[PDB]
């Protein structure tokens, strides 16, 4: 099963920079969402959940086909809450209906990371909408109640190694959990992309507790929280070394996250040899907008 990137007809960098800018301006405008977190974090999670259905063994799932737009995937319990991100992107799509759904969902994540002061994430176009019968079944996204061995095995299906896993998980500095979405609560919140996930893991005083949905989570005195799968990154000695590395080197974290996030968003896609190079979008700040 081969998915060949096909550039939206006649489009180039500046067309996509316009879509980026529209997303970024809306991120700035709709600032009240989720008690003033804004839509950045939910857009990052959306880009990850549309990509994280991929299976390296048969090239099913992944961002290419834009299949989150279909009911089976939209209503995956694992995707509870992401409808907010989809609704945010709807007017963007209406303004730029030439862009494929997969390209828009993935571009939303890249824009959110960058606008939240994260690393630049090179991005490639050419995902093509595929039909409803190509939508992956529910159940391909990871459970949060598990341990390091589960996390390591899970991410092998996405062709991610220990460094890539630990880097990607740094996105859990962003946003918050919501009991009605996932059965986890708390931690306060954040909309600036930093390496704080790793600092919090190493420096806070953590206590395992059972929340009001009867799920276990790690809570700190200062009010932060970690999922069991987050905490597993300091329980496993291989993951712990990498946590320490990123806690001590912001730039290294940014570089590794950028590579892993681009990889995640591109898994399953064959780029022709004459395809355009990856685009690196300017932030609104860099453009004076
Ligand atoms: C073992 C892997 C992972 C597990 C079990 C997991 C689980 C979760 C859970 C349970 C939530 C809370 C959802 C809610 O209640 O609204 C969440 C939020 C979030 N996740 Fe993960 N996740 C994983 C990996 C990732 C990755 C790889 C990324 C992206 C690089 C990511 C990005 C986010 C973001 C940004 C949020 C906050 C969303 C918001 O504020 O609305 N997650 N995750
Ligand atoms: C699983 C997840 C996503 N976001 C967070 C979080 C962010 C800031 C503080 C505490 C938790 N956890």
In spatial order, strands of the major sheet run 2-3-4
CATH-assigned fold name of the largest domain: Peroxidase, domain 1
Distance between the ends = 42 Å
Count of discrete structural domains: 2
Number of strands: 5
Which radius of gyration do the C-alpha atoms yield?
Answer: 18 Å
- For this structure, what is the CATH class of the largest domain? Mainly Alpha
* Small molecules held by this entry: protoporphyrin IX containing FE, 4-methyl-2-phenyl-1H-imidazole
Estimate percent helicity.
40-55%
Give me the number of helical elements.
14
Largest sheet, strands/sense/barrel: 3 strands, antiparallel
Strand content: 5-15%
Helix and strand sequence: EHHHHHHHHHHEEEHHHEH
CATH architecture of the largest domain: Orthogonal Bundle
Structural class, please? mainly alpha
Q: Label the overall shape.
A: globular
Short structural summary:
Residues 99-289 form the Plant heme peroxidase family profile domain. By secondary structure, this protein is mainly alpha-helical.
Explain how this protein is built.
By secondary structure, the chain is mainly alpha-helical. The chain has two domains: 1-141 and 261-289, Orthogonal Bundle (Peroxidase, domain 1), CATH 1.10.520; 142-260, Peroxidase, domain 2, CATH 1.10.420. The protein is 46% helix and 6% strand. The chain contains 14 helices and five strands. The strands form two sheets. Strands 2-3-4 form a three-stranded antiparallel beta sheet. Helix 3 (40-51) packs across helix 6 (101-115) and helix 10 (196-203) crosses helix 12. The radius of gyration is 18 Å and the shape is globular. The chain starts with a strand and ends with a helix. The protein binds protoporphyrin IX containing FE (HEM) and 4-methyl-2-phenyl-1H-imidazole. Residues 41-42, 44-45, 48, 81, 142, 144, 151, 168-169, 171-172, 174-178, 181-182, 184, 227, 229, 261 line the site of protoporphyrin IX containing FE. Residues 99-289 form the Plant heme peroxidase family profile domain. It catalyses: 2 Fe(II)-[cytochrome c] + H2O2 + 2 H(+) = 2 Fe(III)-[cytochrome c] + 2 H2O. It is found in: Mitochondrion intermembrane space; Mitochondrion matrix.
